[PDB]
Structure 1
Amino acid sequence: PEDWKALAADVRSEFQWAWQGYVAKAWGKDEINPVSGTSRSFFIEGHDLGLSLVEALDTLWIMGLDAEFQAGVDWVKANLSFDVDGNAQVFETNIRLVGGLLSAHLASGDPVLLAKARDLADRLAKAFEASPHGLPWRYVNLRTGAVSDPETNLAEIGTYLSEFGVLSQLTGERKYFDMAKRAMRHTLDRRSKIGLMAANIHAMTGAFTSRNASIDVYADSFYEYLWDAWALFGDEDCKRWAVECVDAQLAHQAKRYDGRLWFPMVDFETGAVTGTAQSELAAYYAGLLGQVGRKAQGDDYLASFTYLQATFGVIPESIDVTTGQPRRKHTGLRPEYPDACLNLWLIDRDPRYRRLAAIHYREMKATSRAAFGYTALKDITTRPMTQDDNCPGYWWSEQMKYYYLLFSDTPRIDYGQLQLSTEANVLRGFRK
């Protein structure tokens, strides 16, 4: 039988080794390219904001990598400024930087990390204020407030309430919670008679710009943040809306192909199937199904992705649901499978979820390890699988934390109170 504590130690060792590569090759920069041993920018070309450092902080603290955590916190306090004449994508900036500063604040108690999270949220608020509906524009200039691109989508208007609602709790100012909730209510009030929303929306007209309902591309984390706002804030509207939206998806989007459960895109009014693609991103939804009281359905959905892992090694970035085969050969070093394994495991503690996640971690080690860290893949169909040259910022917050939480039973987390954002930032449950 597997020694889960020895596996947790191995995860921690690999994470510390990756951190050392970041310090050596990419210190203060947004992402490491771990094959070349170089860095790249994420938000603003040539004006890095320490993205991967910020994304790593709560993971380092949970693992007891205290010297490394403090080195990162001290860098942020000396160096990280948002008074920058450049355009930032509102969605990415909130889930990665506001959320990463909040989880590091909650772990450490350090007021400067909260001050920086709040400064950044106030710059992002200008994107919501530029719409008469309160729907955020996709980009905002961090210094001047000027906005660009109102042709947005459910994920990019509806993935704010966890971070903004925690800011409201800590600061006492309800304006953040209210701004985030108003944008979600807009699209919920425009549900069709069958209970679905199209995934594409215009921030100035307030109207849908497509007819496609989705659980993945353009939409994923909207549905997650409805449940999460009930769990974090006790919001009764969000509890109702979470269950309503998922029951509409199970009635009109759930379809079986070759005996396996999938959720293709459909016309939001008629329910006709409008696409045959499913993203790897959709695997999050197996865990959301369990959280909202649909665990049998969640397990059935997880099984579709378990099939893909057993057949292809690495889950394909996109599949055709009619054949079960890849639509793309590259990957993004994606975290959604161990996300779902952790969320289902928190319900019943079944060791099956540990065995499935251990396969996923061992496959990551066999395919993505490079000279100075872990990289996304070029082609999952060759042997060996060929590599690209990038460690995405979300790797530092997500799958190494998921594996460690599944295997370590760490005393630094109250597992009964644990709450994670869509970027895996811990927003409740630290034990100091």
Structure 2
Amino acid sequence: VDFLPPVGVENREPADATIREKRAKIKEMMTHAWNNYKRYAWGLNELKPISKEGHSSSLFGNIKGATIVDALDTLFIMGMKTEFQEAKSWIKKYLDFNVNAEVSVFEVNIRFVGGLLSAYYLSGEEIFRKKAVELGVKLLPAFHTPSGIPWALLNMKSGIGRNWPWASGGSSILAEFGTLHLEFMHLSHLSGDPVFAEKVMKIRTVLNKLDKPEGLYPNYLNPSSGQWGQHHVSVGGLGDSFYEYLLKAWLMSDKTDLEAKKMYFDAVQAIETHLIRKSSGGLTYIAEWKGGLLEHKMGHLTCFAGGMFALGADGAPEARAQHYLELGAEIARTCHESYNRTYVKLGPEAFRFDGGVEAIATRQNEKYYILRPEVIETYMYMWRLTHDPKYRTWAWEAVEALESHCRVNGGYSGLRDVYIARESYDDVQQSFFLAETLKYLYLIFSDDDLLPLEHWIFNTEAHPFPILR
């Protein structure tokens, strides 16, 4: 009910000079992304760094300031105190949730609810707690369906929701409704109202009543009927953070959510048996599965699973702890190869395992890189759980690639084709570059006890939450 000073936020300079200098560079990258956001797009959701103006994704409806809220905890942990205060003052005056238009429930939960929650737990500023709970209340009508599986889209003023127009069968998407759990548990903790926890616990009850085809989770679930939609399974986009939040719910509960633990380890065993394959060149990858038929392609989004597997190792029964650490390392290696086999040295959105080269994209519309964090995210977990220096080496390769190819005068831009020398800027500075990509890089080159994993569970937008006991 009452704020306690956060554990593990004391930020010490690393003892090795090269590590200090590398981390200082990452802070300089955040200063570049933030200062240009403020110069050209202050109060708008994202920055267009080439056009030097705002970018307003329809995922956020009429809410403002996504980059401000997403950046709060990164600014705080990097010691950017003046910037943190300037963000806080904007939030107090201008962050407004009583607006028309539809928002993505998933996106607003992971970025706005999550970003405000972390800012509160780090700083103790009650405005963040007040705003997080206000937004949580506004999201409750998304769960007003026969099954309790929430709508994808919600008009927060009218409380009326619907699913994505082109969603397969009108279904709700597994990663979207499956990635509410951590935030809603903290909303119940801080508000004292059990309504929030009950909403996400009901999602569990629905899932556990269903037969899982081959132990796998389809990415589509119909909220009107509570039955599966199309039997498309992926540990990348549309599925991934559901699995992530099974593991993290167990950890964030101080390992008391035994249902989450069983769901997670059952799910990962089925993923290993049905989805995980080895290429002829010896690379481990996680394929997509459509009604039983594997497609031997892996996504940049799927690369988060390396860190997920490793993070789940200590809880697993031995000798599967070492098995999960080694599986996480093999995913990390494959994702590093997908990075290293491009021209720019940042990996494509999806990469295939057929000749003539492995771990490369061939489809033109899959060669892009939109500043995504998942490979660096996996490097961070592997570094913290193994301290193998190659994870810092691989992280620094990504830093140099970002600086050579994504840094522009007006911020950071994504790329359309990581396989060509000529620049191909998409002119969007994604807010998750500041929330996630730069935060995980900064943590990689920090000591282990800055946001130590023993006490902090990262939400899927890299917003750290304390363990609930």
TM-score higher than 0.5 here?
yes
Question: 1:188·1:197 contact (CA, 8 Å) conserved in 2?
Answer: no
**Does 1:88 pair with 2:103?**
yes
Look up the match of 1:332.
370
Look up the match of 1:302.
332
Q: Distance in 2 between matches of 1:43 and 1:177?
A: 28
Residue by residue over 1:32-68, the C-alpha shift from the partner in whole angstroms, topping out at 9 and shown as x without a partner, is 0011111111247883510001110000000000010
**C-alpha deviation, 1:321, in angstroms:** 2.8
Look up the match of 2:288.
265
2:431 to 393, 409, 412: 393
Look up the match of 1:223.
243
RMSD: 1.8
Amino acid at match of 2:179: T
1:190 to 200, 210, 213: 210
**C-alpha deviation, 1:136, in angstroms:** 0.4
**C-alpha deviation, 1:329, in angstroms:** 2.3
**C-alpha deviation, 1:376, in angstroms:** 0.7
Q: Distance in 2 between matches of 1:412 and 1:4?
A: 14
Look up the match of 2:277.
255
Amino acid at match of 1:296: E
1:362 to 374, 382, 400: 400
Look up the match of 2:147.
133
Residue by residue over 1:373-427, the C-alpha shift from the partner in whole angstroms, topping out at 9 and shown as x without a partner, is 1011122222134212000111110010001111122875345312211100011
Question: 1:84·1:143 contact (CA, 8 Å) conserved in 2?
Answer: yes
1:178-217 aligned at under 5 Å gives the runs 178-192=198-212, 194-217=214-237
**C-alpha deviation, 1:119, in angstroms:** 1.1
Look up the match of 1:322.
354
Question: 1:37·1:371 contact (CA, 8 Å) conserved in 2?
Answer: no
Look up the match of 2:161.
147
Q: Distance in 2 between matches of 1:115 and 1:47?
A: 20
1:380 to 418, 432, 437: 418
Question: 2:285·2:334 contact (CA, 8 Å) conserved in 1?
Answer: yes
Question: 2:152·2:173 contact (CA, 8 Å) conserved in 1?
Answer: no
Amino acid at match of 1:139: L
Q: Distance in 1 between matches of 2:197 and 2:390?
A: 37
Aligned partner of residue 398 in structure 1, secondary structure? helix
Question: 2:415·2:426 contact (CA, 8 Å) conserved in 1?
Answer: yes
Question: 2:63·2:96 contact (CA, 8 Å) conserved in 1?
Answer: no
Structure-2 change in CA distance of 1:45 and 1:91 (3 Å): closer
**C-alpha deviation, 1:26, in angstroms:** 0.4
Aligned partner of residue 307 in structure 2, secondary structure? helix
Structure-2 change in CA distance of 1:12 and 1:145 (3 Å): same
Amino acid at match of 1:198: P
Look up the match of 1:236.
258
Look up the match of 2:167.
none
Question: 1:191·1:197 contact (CA, 8 Å) conserved in 2?
Answer: no
Amino acid at match of 2:346: V
Question: 1:277·1:319 contact (CA, 8 Å) conserved in 2?
Answer: yes
Extract unaligned runs of 5+ from structure 2. Answer: 1-15, 164-169, 314-323
Aligned partner of residue 278 in structure 1, secondary structure? strand
Look up the match of 2:80.
65
Question: 1:22·1:32 contact (CA, 8 Å) conserved in 2?
Answer: yes
**C-alpha deviation, 1:162, in angstroms:** 0.6
Question: 1:212·1:267 contact (CA, 8 Å) conserved in 2?
Answer: yes
Extract unaligned runs of 5+ from structure 1. Answer: none
